[PDB]
Design an enzyme around this catalytic site. Structure first.
Site, PDB file in Angstrom:
ATOM      1  N   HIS C  87      -4.060  55.684  60.180  1.00 49.95           N
ATOM      2  CA  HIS C  87      -3.712  54.266  60.032  1.00 49.95           C
ATOM      3  C   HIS C  87      -4.868  53.460  60.606  1.00 49.95           C
ATOM      4  O   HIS C  87      -5.692  53.997  61.375  1.00 49.95           O
ATOM      5  CB  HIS C  87      -2.409  53.926  60.779  1.00 49.95           C
ATOM      6  CG  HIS C  87      -1.248  54.695  60.294  1.00 49.95           C
ATOM      7  ND1 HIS C  87      -0.572  54.321  59.168  1.00 49.95           N
ATOM      8  CD2 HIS C  87      -0.637  55.804  60.818  1.00 49.95           C
ATOM      9  CE1 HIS C  87       0.429  55.166  59.010  1.00 49.95           C
ATOM     10  NE2 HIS C  87       0.411  56.089  59.988  1.00 49.95           N
ATOM     11  N   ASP C  90      -6.262  45.608  59.460  1.00 51.94           N
ATOM     12  CA  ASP C  90      -7.016  44.481  58.904  1.00 51.94           C
ATOM     13  C   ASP C  90      -6.321  43.219  59.373  1.00 51.94           C
ATOM     14  O   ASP C  90      -5.161  42.995  59.046  1.00 51.94           O
ATOM     15  CB  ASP C  90      -7.029  44.531  57.387  1.00 51.94           C
ATOM     16  CG  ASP C  90      -7.598  43.369  56.579  1.00 51.94           C
ATOM     17  OD1 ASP C  90      -7.924  42.336  57.161  1.00 51.94           O
ATOM     18  OD2 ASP C  90      -7.758  43.549  55.332  1.00 51.94           O
ATOM     19  N   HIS C  92      -6.400  39.378  58.849  1.00 50.62           N
ATOM     20  CA  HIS C  92      -6.916  38.298  58.000  1.00 50.62           C
ATOM     21  C   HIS C  92      -7.501  37.156  58.825  1.00 50.62           C
ATOM     22  O   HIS C  92      -8.210  36.332  58.235  1.00 50.62           O
ATOM     23  CB  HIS C  92      -5.840  37.773  57.064  1.00 50.62           C
ATOM     24  CG  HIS C  92      -5.545  38.650  55.918  1.00 50.62           C
ATOM     25  ND1 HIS C  92      -4.705  38.194  54.883  1.00 50.62           N
ATOM     26  CD2 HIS C  92      -5.878  39.927  55.609  1.00 50.62           C
ATOM     27  CE1 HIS C  92      -4.571  39.167  54.020  1.00 50.62           C
ATOM     28  NE2 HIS C  92      -5.256  40.237  54.420  1.00 50.62           N
ATOM     29  N   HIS C 127      -2.432  43.796  58.450  1.00 50.46           N
ATOM     30  CA  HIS C 127      -1.807  44.956  57.769  1.00 50.46           C
ATOM     31  C   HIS C 127      -2.685  46.174  57.870  1.00 50.46           C
ATOM     32  O   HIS C 127      -3.922  46.069  58.048  1.00 50.46           O
ATOM     33  CB  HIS C 127      -1.488  44.610  56.332  1.00 50.46           C
ATOM     34  CG  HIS C 127      -2.677  44.364  55.469  1.00 50.46           C
ATOM     35  ND1 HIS C 127      -3.426  45.346  54.859  1.00 50.46           N
ATOM     36  CD2 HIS C 127      -3.216  43.200  55.066  1.00 50.46           C
ATOM     37  CE1 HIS C 127      -4.380  44.769  54.095  1.00 50.46           C
ATOM     38  NE2 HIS C 127      -4.278  43.448  54.246  1.00 50.46           N
ATOM     39  N   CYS C 128      -2.077  47.320  57.657  1.00 48.21           N
ATOM     40  CA  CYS C 128      -2.810  48.593  57.589  1.00 48.21           C
ATOM     41  C   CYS C 128      -3.548  48.630  56.240  1.00 48.21           C
ATOM     42  O   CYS C 128      -3.080  48.068  55.246  1.00 48.21           O
ATOM     43  CB  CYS C 128      -1.814  49.727  57.755  1.00 48.21           C
ATOM     44  SG  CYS C 128      -2.576  51.357  57.862  1.00 48.21           S
ATOM     45  N   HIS C 138       0.625  51.817  52.273  1.00 50.86           N
ATOM     46  CA  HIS C 138       0.937  51.584  53.692  1.00 50.86           C
ATOM     47  C   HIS C 138       1.528  50.205  53.901  1.00 50.86           C
ATOM     48  O   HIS C 138       2.457  50.060  54.681  1.00 50.86           O
ATOM     49  CB  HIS C 138      -0.291  51.794  54.552  1.00 50.86           C
ATOM     50  CG  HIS C 138      -0.614  53.221  54.772  1.00 50.86           C
ATOM     51  ND1 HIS C 138      -0.742  53.757  56.053  1.00 50.86           N
ATOM     52  CD2 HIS C 138      -0.874  54.196  53.900  1.00 50.86           C
ATOM     53  CE1 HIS C 138      -0.991  55.030  55.931  1.00 50.86           C
ATOM     54  NE2 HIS C 138      -1.119  55.303  54.640  1.00 50.86           N
ATOM     55  N   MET C 143       3.766  48.336  56.855  1.00 50.13           N
ATOM     56  CA  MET C 143       2.667  48.152  57.830  1.00 50.13           C
ATOM     57  C   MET C 143       1.967  46.803  57.660  1.00 50.13           C
ATOM     58  O   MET C 143       0.834  46.698  57.208  1.00 50.13           O
ATOM     59  CB  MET C 143       1.654  49.270  57.742  1.00 50.13           C
ATOM     60  CG  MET C 143       2.281  50.566  58.055  1.00 50.13           C
ATOM     61  SD  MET C 143       1.207  51.870  58.690  1.00 50.13           S
ATOM     62  CE  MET C 143       0.666  51.169  60.237  1.00 50.13           C
ATOM     63  N   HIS C 248      12.695  28.616  50.771  1.00 48.74           N
ATOM     64  CA  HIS C 248      13.521  27.402  50.676  1.00 48.74           C
ATOM     65  C   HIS C 248      14.595  27.488  51.751  1.00 48.74           C
ATOM     66  O   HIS C 248      15.271  28.503  51.855  1.00 48.74           O
ATOM     67  CB  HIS C 248      14.189  27.333  49.280  1.00 48.74           C
ATOM     68  CG  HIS C 248      15.077  26.159  49.109  1.00 48.74           C
ATOM     69  ND1 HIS C 248      14.594  25.032  48.573  1.00 48.74           N
ATOM     70  CD2 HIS C 248      16.394  25.967  49.351  1.00 48.74           C
ATOM     71  CE1 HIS C 248      15.529  24.124  48.527  1.00 48.74           C
ATOM     72  NE2 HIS C 248      16.635  24.630  49.040  1.00 48.74           N
ATOM     73  N   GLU C 272      10.838  20.718  49.166  1.00 45.31           N
ATOM     74  CA  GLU C 272      12.093  21.475  48.913  1.00 45.31           C
ATOM     75  C   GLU C 272      11.872  22.965  49.038  1.00 45.31           C
ATOM     76  O   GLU C 272      12.684  23.635  49.680  1.00 45.31           O
ATOM     77  CB  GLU C 272      12.712  21.048  47.571  1.00 45.31           C
ATOM     78  CG  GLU C 272      11.973  21.532  46.308  1.00 45.31           C
ATOM     79  CD  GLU C 272      12.555  20.962  45.026  1.00 45.31           C
ATOM     80  OE1 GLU C 272      13.776  21.143  44.787  1.00 45.31           O
ATOM     81  OE2 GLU C 272      11.802  20.340  44.255  1.00 45.31           O
ATOM     82  N   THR C 273      10.832  23.445  48.384  1.00 45.05           N
ATOM     83  CA  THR C 273      10.473  24.852  48.296  1.00 45.05           C
ATOM     84  C   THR C 273       8.977  24.954  48.399  1.00 45.05           C
ATOM     85  O   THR C 273       8.272  24.073  47.880  1.00 45.05           O
ATOM     86  CB  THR C 273      10.962  25.401  46.964  1.00 45.05           C
ATOM     87  OG1 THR C 273      12.358  25.195  46.889  1.00 45.05           O
ATOM     88  CG2 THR C 273      10.654  26.868  46.784  1.00 45.05           C
ATOM     89  N   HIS C 299      13.237  31.536  46.746  1.00 46.21           N
ATOM     90  CA  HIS C 299      14.025  30.875  45.702  1.00 46.21           C
ATOM     91  C   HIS C 299      13.752  31.443  44.309  1.00 46.21           C
ATOM     92  O   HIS C 299      13.937  30.725  43.309  1.00 46.21           O
ATOM     93  CB  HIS C 299      13.885  29.354  45.787  1.00 46.21           C
ATOM     94  CG  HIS C 299      15.120  28.665  45.334  1.00 46.21           C
ATOM     95  ND1 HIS C 299      15.554  28.629  44.027  1.00 46.21           N
ATOM     96  CD2 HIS C 299      15.987  27.868  46.015  1.00 46.21           C
ATOM     97  CE1 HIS C 299      16.647  27.847  43.941  1.00 46.21           C
ATOM     98  NE2 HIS C 299      16.957  27.397  45.159  1.00 46.21           N
TER      99      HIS C 299
HETATM  100 CU   LIG Z   1      -0.926  52.804  57.864  1.00 45.28          CU
HETATM  101 CU   LIG Z   2      18.363  26.040  45.444  1.00 44.12          CU
HETATM  102 CU   LIG Z   3      -5.205  41.947  53.338  1.00 45.05          CU
END
Ligand SMILES: [Cu+2]
Ligand SMILES: [Cu+2]
Ligand SMILES: [Cu+2]
Ligand SMILES: OC[C@H]1O[C@@](CO)(O[C@H]2O[C@H](CO)[C@@H](O)[C@H](O)[C@H]2O)[C@@H](O)[C@@H]1O
Ligand SMILES: OC[C@H]1O[C@@](CO)(O[C@H]2O[C@H](CO)[C@@H](O)[C@H](O)[C@H]2O)[C@@H](O)[C@@H]1O
Ligand SMILES: OC[C@H]1O[C@@](CO)(O[C@H]2O[C@H](CO)[C@@H](O)[C@H](O)[C@H]2O)[C@@H](O)[C@@H]1O
Ligand SMILES: OC[C@H]1O[C@@](CO)(O[C@H]2O[C@H](CO)[C@@H](O)[C@H](O)[C@H]2O)[C@@H](O)[C@@H]1O
Ligand SMILES: OC[C@H]1O[C@@](CO)(O[C@H]2O[C@H](CO)[C@@H](O)[C@H](O)[C@H]2O)[C@@H](O)[C@@H]1O
Ligand SMILES: OC[C@H]1O[C@@](CO)(O[C@H]2O[C@H](CO)[C@@H](O)[C@H](O)[C@H]2O)[C@@H](O)[C@@H]1O
Ligand SMILES: [Cu+2]
Ligand SMILES: [Cu+2]
Ligand SMILES: [Cu+2]
Lengths: 345, 345, 345
Positions: C87, C90, C92, C127-128, C138, C143, C248, C272-273, C299
């Protein structure tokens, strides 16, 4: 009776871009481009799957065209007699006649000349659109590219600061719909026409078999990785004519991102991942701060790793240990931490 | 004990919109609307496929309601005794009680009156939401529409300039999930209840069989194309209660686009394609500059051309050859260009 | 040779968040975090389906890490000997070496220490990403988590006004791809390795079997509903490492929303969303105005109701009849309205 200077542009294959200025002191010109339709068999993945592609200028994507706000763009679209069906072109940058599609339908053996005024700044899709169900089929067979309309003063950050790129790449993303036989193997056809009926059935389920940059899985990796250097500001134009994408530069960011791709809008800053709505182009600037390999993906990682949608940058320069460092290389876990680590199960 | 004037609104079927003011000098009112639930068989495609729909006011989408910031909206929801199941309503515009859903559950034979204060400007979805797995089923059976809450001074560009539309259309987009038999033919049912189990199985795979505007493929083409004229500023409200969309006006642009649909945010300018996140409404202004047919699509072109999601505008006026012209009509390719064109293969 | 104070952080399981300051007068620190990889069988739905998960710190999502702009983040990643494969991680949020992935590959029995400078404000996925097709596997096995890099002055509205939350929750959304047998029943495996081949086949079709918050359908409902009170400003961080989402708050709004999740950008108001592009985190503030149950969903309501993607808030306080009221409880439809209601069929 349009009394402006003519400027002839020689297109280059993606991901490279023809020569152009960012900021210019030239006045409006008639910018002259030629696109030649080529139907051809193409290889689309690492296992050698072939595809009866339809392209502008022999590539997926079609080449990036670059002009300035207020230019006129005079496009000669050519449909060689060796092709098998009619083609046309819709420029999302253009106003009227379905983007030009209603003025550019050409049979094999014909050519047409369309002029459209570049009144709208940004990156935009162009694509074939012959009518009805041929519209999505031609597009997902490869008949799409992009055009960039720069402001005459070049890009800005939307806060009165000039932005200039040292290097531009055009990443066209293509969703492909390749029929399979009963055993799950991709099927081969002798002509686009012969592939159509089986392809339409795959398209109808909306799940691509391949999602590729520059026309094939692996196109922009290995020998064809994208070059840059630490300190360079790189513009990455990304288009998707049919389907959403979520670009991400693994190990980097989008310093300035026009997700919707239109330079009359201030870019967003510091993005991890952005979103290209299907039927558009967007653009991201990034200044490289670290050397090494970067992966540039759509961040549906299944698409990126398993359906073909990974490019690589190879960036030369010196590592910056202040931004990131390996403090301790992999080492056996120590026994004194056993109890404490049990709280993280 | 709310001591405000009452104003009764007569809803009209989409894509048209009831009479309203943009900017108003009226103070807050109790704006009175009636929605009547109708379960009915509807035709959804050009081949005559039927569907056991559930609707507000007999349409997909439900009608557009228009009010101003600070109005109260008093909704009489009616569930006629000829219907077969309970229904309610969630207004995304409203605050509390699951948007009103927890206060509006009505059996056949009943009606309920909900009041909600219009504190939030924008276009918003409303939809049925009776509980649990009935929520998505009722929504994708047609029980969704939209409400627009205008600022009292009308729309603005977010830079202190008034924007006014000459014409408004409401485009409700509907994802539909129609079961097929072993041969691939769409299956018919005598009642919504009977369709449910087979429909849920299609819904679970998240791929619609149809994606339609105004309730059916072809609804907004031919006889029912949307009219406009060169020079008119047209507001196009687009909603999608369940699934993303990427609207595009083929041959045009979005001059001002509220993608997320909320007028407290400046619109984006000059978009090619925008994005309606499922569960929302957005809005685009466009001033028509050219006459002729425009296609208004979701720019997954497979959905647009093959699953039903195309509308047309028919725009009257005079062609502007400065914005776009056919310089040369289709003509045989000339032999002198042979060598040069070979570089574009 | 980085001469800054060290600050040790004890992570807590989502949806809760470790103690932190919003605005701080501390200078940059080396903020020390430990993540321990745990491969384990987990229950993912209400019918007791199990899944061979792979996690950071035993949860889906991995815990939220919170630091300030200009902090250094020193991560000890541990891969216990009871795990079965390599494993890495990363971030971001980080610059270089594939987000740290190229510096953190550890076999079972090993640990590694990565430091990355928090130069970019926002919420970000981590994330892995061990390489190739293991990257999406993964990630969709669990992960992934998120890190929040706050400005040192805390959040602002992009218009020179401080925003402060009274309460923070981290909603990690997970797309899962669980194989089925010929009868449609979810299949069980003894190890992640054994599940891989069948799982990859499901992943390739891009349609999840489950879409869950906090690792399982129903995780954030009932006993585990999220608490709040009328008047509290709540920050809801939402991440999705692989696939788009459209959050939402049913009965509420996003008062301030950073859809793309990056605090150098002004938030959008009154949504709203919103939209979480796969491979990112976003964040929404909301001040609760009404008591009662709220549903917090993606939603696509099919995903929300039928594939597991619903959370609940239980909000204490007093109902505000001005914002919303039931004017008339359900009552028999009156006969005098018959003719008028016939116009709404
Ligand atoms: Cu992993
Ligand atoms: Cu709705
Ligand atoms: Cu990524
Ligand atoms: O109504 C405009 C319509 O025609 C097109 C071409 O198909 O542009 C043309 O418009 C007029 C013909 O009806 C002429 O005035 C003009 O010369 C011509 O080029 C389309 O672009 C448009 O849809
Ligand atoms: O994908 C279904 C099934 O088909 C097989 C061959 O029978 O492989 C095909 O599909 C793979 C995934 O797209 C491709 O890598 C390969 O090129 C193609 O032949 C099986 O291997 C697979 O289980
Ligand atoms: O806790 C509020 C809860 O009730 C609803 C209706 O289902 O609104 C009501 O709230 C209270 C009842 O518990 C009353 O004070 C109020 O009069 C009533 O309308 C929901 O909207 C909310 O979820
Ligand atoms: O789509 C699968 C398969 O079913 C058939 C009939 O057997 O057509 C059905 O599906 C078409 C695509 O949705 C529809 O146009 C038609 O209405 C429906 O009966 C086949 O023609 C098709 O191959
Ligand atoms: O080219 C940089 C490349 O290496 C990584 C680790 O895999 O960071 C390293 O970079 C250099 C080695 O080539 C060294 O200068 C540096 O000390 C080392 O940590 C990657 O992050 C990057 O991709
Ligand atoms: O979903 C297809 C089919 O499989 C069955 C069992 O044969 O149910 C499975 O799928 C359901 C939907 O995901 C799950 O609720 C259940 O846990 C699973 O066994 C059928 O009931 C269904 O028709
Ligand atoms: Cu074509
Ligand atoms: Cu298009
Ligand atoms: Cu209903």
């Amino acid at each position: 009776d349009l009394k402006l200077p003519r400027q002839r542009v020689d297109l280059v294959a993606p991901p490279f871009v023809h020569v152009h200025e960012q900021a210019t002191k030239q006045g409006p010109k008639i910018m002259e481009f030629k696109l030649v339709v080529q139907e051809k068999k193409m290889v689309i993945d690492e296992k050698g799957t072939t595809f009866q592609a339809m392209t502008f200028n022999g590539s997926m994507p079609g080449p990036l065209m670059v002009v300035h706000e207020g230019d006129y763009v005079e496009v000669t679209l050519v449909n060689p007699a060796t092709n098998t069906m009619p083609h046309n072109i819709d420029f999302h940058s253009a106003t009227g006649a379905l983007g030009g599609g209603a003025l550019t339908l050409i049979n094999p053996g014909e050519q047409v000349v369309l002029r459209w005024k570049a009144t709208r700044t940004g990156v935009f899709v162009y694509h074939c659109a012959p009518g009805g169900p041929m519209i999505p089929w031609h597009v997902v067979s490869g008949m799409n590219g992009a055009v960039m309309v720069l402001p005459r003063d070049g890009l800005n950050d939307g806060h009165g600061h000039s932005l200039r790129y040292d290097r531009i790449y055009y990443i066209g993303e293509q969703d492909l719909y390749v029929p399979r036989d009963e055993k799950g193997n991709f099927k081969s056809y002798d002509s686009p026409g012969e592939a159509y009926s089986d392809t339409e059935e795959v398209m109808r389920k909306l799940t691509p078999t391949h999602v590729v940059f520059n026309g094939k899985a692996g196109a922009l990796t290995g020998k064809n990785a994208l070059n840059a250097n630490v300190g360079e500001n790189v513009l990455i134009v990304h288009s998707q004519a049919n389907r959403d994408s979520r670009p991400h530069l693994i190990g980097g960011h989008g310093d300035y991102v026009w997700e919707t791709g239109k330079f009359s809008n201030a870019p967003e800053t510091g993005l991890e991942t952005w979103f290209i709505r299907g039927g558009s182009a967007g653009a991201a600037l990034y200044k490289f701060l670290q050397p090494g390999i970067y992966a540039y993906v759509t961040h549906n990682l299944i698409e990126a790793a398993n359906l073909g949608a990974t490019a690589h940058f190879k960036v030369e320069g010196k590592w910056n240990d202040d931004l990131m460092t390996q403090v301790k290389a992999p080492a056996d876990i120590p026994t004194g931490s056993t109890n404490e680590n049990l709280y993280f199960q």
